[PDB]
Structures are given as structure tokens and as C-alpha cells.
Amino acid sequence: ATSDDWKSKAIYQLLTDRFGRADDSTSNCSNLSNYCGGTYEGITKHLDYISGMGFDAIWISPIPKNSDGGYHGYWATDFYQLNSNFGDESQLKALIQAAHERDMYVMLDVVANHAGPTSNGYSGYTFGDASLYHPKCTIDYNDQTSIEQCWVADELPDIDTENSDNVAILNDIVSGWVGNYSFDGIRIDTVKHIRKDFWTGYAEAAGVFATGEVFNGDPAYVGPYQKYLPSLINYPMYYALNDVFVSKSKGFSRISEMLGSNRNAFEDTSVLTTFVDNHDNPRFLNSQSDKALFKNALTYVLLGEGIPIVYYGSEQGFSGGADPANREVLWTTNYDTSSDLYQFIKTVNSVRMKSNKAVYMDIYVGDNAYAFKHGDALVVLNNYGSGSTNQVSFSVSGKFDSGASLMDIVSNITTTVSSDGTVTFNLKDGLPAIFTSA
Numbered sequence: 001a002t003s004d005d006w007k008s009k010a011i012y013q014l015l016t017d018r019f020g021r022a023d024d025s026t027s028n029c030s031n032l033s034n035y036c037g038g039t040y041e042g043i044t045k046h047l048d049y050i051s052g053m054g055f056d057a058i059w060i061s062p063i064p065k066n067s068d069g070g071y072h073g074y075w076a077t078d079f080y081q082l083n084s085n086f087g088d089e090s091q092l093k094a095l096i097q098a099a100h101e102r103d104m105y106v107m108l109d110v111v112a113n114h115a116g117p118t119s120n121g122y123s124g125y126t127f128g129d130a131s132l133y134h135p136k137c138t139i140d141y142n143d144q145t146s147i148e149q150c151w152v153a154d155e156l157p158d159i160d161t162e163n164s165d166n167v168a169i170l171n172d173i174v175s176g177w178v179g180n181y182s183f184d185g186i187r188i189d190t191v192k193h194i195r196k197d198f199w200t201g202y203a204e205a206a207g208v209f210a211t212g213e214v215f216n217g218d219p220a221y222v223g224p225y226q227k228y229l230p231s232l233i234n235y236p237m238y239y240a241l242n243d244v245f246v247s248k249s250k251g252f253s254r255i256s257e258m259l260g261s262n263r264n265a266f267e268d269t270s271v272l273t274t275f276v277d278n279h280d281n282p283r284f285l286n287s288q289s290d291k292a293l294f295k296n297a298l299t300y301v302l303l304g305e306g307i308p309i310v311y312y313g314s315e316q317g318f319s320g321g322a323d324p325a326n327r328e329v330l331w332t333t334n335y336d337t338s339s340d341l342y343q344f345i346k347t348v349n350s351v352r353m354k355s356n357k358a359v360y361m362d363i364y365v366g367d368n369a370y371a372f373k374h375g376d377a378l379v380v381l382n383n384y385g386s387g388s389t390n391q392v393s394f395s396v397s398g399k400f401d402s403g404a405s406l407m408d409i410v411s412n413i414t415t416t417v418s419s420d421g422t423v424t425f426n427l428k429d430g431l432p433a434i435f436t437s438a
């Protein structure tokens with residue numbers, strides 16, 4: 001599927017090892033650093049749980065055979081063999097067919113930069129001897145040559161992407177994964193760790209929409225990558241959202257400033273993928289346990305500028321910290337669709353799905369409150385947190401008619417635009433508000 005096809009989607013990011021199994025067990029996993037037993041069949045069994053929340057795309061773990069302990073898929077050995085932990089060809093195709101029957105997209109995570117660590121040599125690996133990898137070195141994160149030539153985590157064999165045989169093989173691998181399985185898009189791992197010009201050829205080989213992971217918070221660093229890939233993961237907005245909602249070290253001017261910095265660094269901000277947590281960073285609720293702040297952040301993710309990504313287990317209030325504690329098994333929850341955050345996400349996705357897709361950011365930039373439009377809906381965020389009944393007030397002159405009746409989808413709140421265009425109302429429990437006009 002194309003960039004334009006993906007612009008309207010909202011992605012549920014899951015770890016294949018951690019989402020679901022064929023069995024109905026709610027037992028915890030005793031070691032989150034090794035395989036817990038999640039499978040493709042486990043995702044198929046629970047697709048209705050995911051679509052029930054209003055997601056219409058999933059991003060799954062990399063699929064190839066991995067080195068020991070590579071439950072996350074990022075440590076490939078033989079790129080042309082499936083990881084048998086997750087299932088076989090038939091089970092992966094049955095998942096993609098089940099998703100497609102539900103009009104859901106499937107996005108494959110892909111690695112070109114590295115293989116899994118060695119304990120001996122490279123027997124069994126697609127890149128089957130030391131000469132096919134860059135010499136081992138540690139990354140100097142001030143030196144882009146070091147970032148590209150040296151080994152991730154000091155330990156992941158860095159494929160020699162300047163060997164043209166290796167480039168042709170990497171392009172063949174991603175063309176085959178996408179073509180053989182009819183994936184609709186890819187999420188590209190470790191983009192900053194290979195020279196930019198590689199990515200043109202690799203994404204063309206894949207032949208579908210790609211969102212690249214450039215793990216850096218600076219728009220001036222990430223933005224230039226959109227010359228080479230059609231979308232990047234919005235790490236710069238992730239840091240702004242965390243400043244406003246998790247530490248409250250900035251007011252909402254930080255989100256307004258970051259929208260402007262992204263407009264100045266990126267060709268097309270509308271296709272960047274928005275998120276507030278993921279598998280590489282502590283969950284939101286680890287640092288900031290206030291679920292009203294989480295709900296405000298999730299509202300930004302789902303309705304603000306960009307393509308939303310929500311990390312699995314957000315809807316069950318998961319609160320684990322540093323990797324792998326943030327990679328909890330979902331089945332302890334028994335896929336409870338009555339969970340407050342599941343019903344919240346379903347509510348917000350119903351706005352997303354069914355409103356015009358025109359987003360107008362920065363209707364109001366306050367210190368502790370903020371408003372924007374998502375289609376016809378007026379979205380109001382705040383960082384006062386749980387228990388707040390603070391007043392929020394701002395002008396909507398020329399955006400909503402004077403005297404217009406606004407009704408909040410989240411809480412009971414009804415408010416009338418004043419005779420001169422001002423919206424003024426009290427929060428309920430610090431919750432986001434999503435107003436429509438009568």
C-alpha cells in the first residue's frame with residue numbers, strides 16, 4: 001500500500017512473542033529476556049480485540065530466524081528462514097489473510113543493518129563469514145561515520161552495506177518478504193546506522209510504504225531522512241509529548257514549537273508516525289502513573305498530525321520500565337475489552353475513523369491546556385492530571401460560530417461558545433475533551 005493509502009490508518013504495534021498464543025493461559029512469563037511463546041496463530045485468534053479498539057493496521061516483529069534469545073526478531077541469522085518460534089509460512093499467511101479479510105493492514109518490521117551476535121562464527125548465517133561485516137568497533141554517537149560503520153550495542157555484527165553483493169542480497173530479502181507475504185508496509189529498523197543513499201534502493205525493492213526508525217530527537221537530524229524514505233517515526237514529537245505529559249518539564253508551547261520545527265525539517269509531516277511509547281523506551285505509565293495524563297497523550301497520538309501508533313498493552317495500563325520490562329505478555333490480562341483504557345482508545349479511534357481527516361493544530365496553545373481540530377471535532381488537551389476540575393478557556397472566533405452548542409464525547413460536558421467566540425468550561429478528572437457542534 002502507498003503513502004496516501006496509509007495516511008488514514010492507525011497502527012497497533014505488537015511484539016509477536018508477547019501478544020498471544022493458541023492456548024487460553026493467563027499465566028505470566030517467568031523471564032521477559034527470553035521467548036515467552038507468542039505466535040502468529042495467537043495474533044489471528046485475537047484480531048477482533050485489536051480491531052475492536054478501532055485500529056486498522058498492525059506492526060509485527062521481524063520474521064527471520066534469530067540467534068539465541070532473539071525473541072524480538074532483531075538478531076537475524078538466516079534471513080531467508082522464518083523464526084520457528086512464531087510459526088510457519090502457512091500460519092503467517094493465515095494471519096495476513098485474516099487481517100486482510102477485516103480490511104486491516106499488516107506492517108513488517110525489517111532489519112538491514114545487522115545480524116545477531118555470535119558465540120562462535122557465522123555458520124548458518126546469510127552473511128556467512130566475518131569478511132561480510134564491518135570490523136568491530138564501538139559507536140561514537142557524535143560521528144555519523146561511526147554510527148554507520150560500528151556495531152550497535154557493541155555486539156550486533158554490522159553487515160557491510162558497502163559490499164555490493166551484500167546490498168543486492170538485502171534488497172532481495174525485503175522484496176521477497178513483502179512479495180511472498182503481501183505485507184502492506186514496512187517499519188525499517190536502525191535507519192541511522194546505514195548510509196542514507198542505501199535506503200532509496202532498499203525501500204524501492206520493498207515496493208510498499210516504509211516508516212523508518214531514526215532514533216534521534218532532533219528534527220534537523222531526522223528530517224533529512226525523508227529525502228530517502230517516505231515516512232519516519234516521529235521521535236522529535238515523542239520527546240515533546242513526554243516533556244508536557246510525563247515530567248511536565250514544559251508547557252504546551254513545546255508541542256507547538258515541535259510542530260513548527262518538524263514543518264521546517266520534513267517534506268511531509270502528515271505521514272510521520274506519532275507515538276508516546278514503544279518497545280525501546282519505558283512505558284508512559286512507568287514514570288507517570290496518572291491515567292488522565294496518559295489519556296491526554298493518547299488523544300494527541302490518535303488525533304493529532306501524523307499516522308498514529310499505539311504500543312500493545314497501553315490499553316491494559318501496562319507500566320513496565322527499561323527493556324525488557326516494557327515487553328510484558330498481554331495474556332495475563334485475558335484480553336479484557338472492558339478495561340478503562342481499552343474503552344477510551346475505542347472512543348477516540350471512533351472520532352479518528354469517522355471525522356474528516358483535515359487536522360488543524362494550534363487552535364489554542366496555553367501553558368497547561370491546548371486545542372486543535374480533527375475534522376469537525378474540537379480536541380482539548382491538558383496536563384493538570386487526575387482530579388482536576390480546572391477551567392479551560394480559549395477563543396474559537398472564526399472556527400466555531402458564536403452561540404454554538406458543543407458536546408464532549410469523553411465526559412458529560414456541554415458548553416456554549418460565548419456571544420463573542422470564547423469556549424470556557426471546567427474539566428472532569430483532568431480528562432481530554434473532544435467536542436462536536438450541534
Ligand SMILES: *[C@@H]1O[C@H](CO)[C@@H](O)[C@H](O)[C@H]1NC(C)=O
Nearest residue numbers: 079080172173174176177180
Ligand atoms: C520468496 O519466495 C521465493 C519462492 O519460494 C523464495 O525463493 C525466496 O527465498 C522467498 N524470499 C524470502 C525473503 O523469504
Ligand SMILES: [Ca+2]
Nearest residue numbers: 148149158193
Ligand atoms: Ca551499519
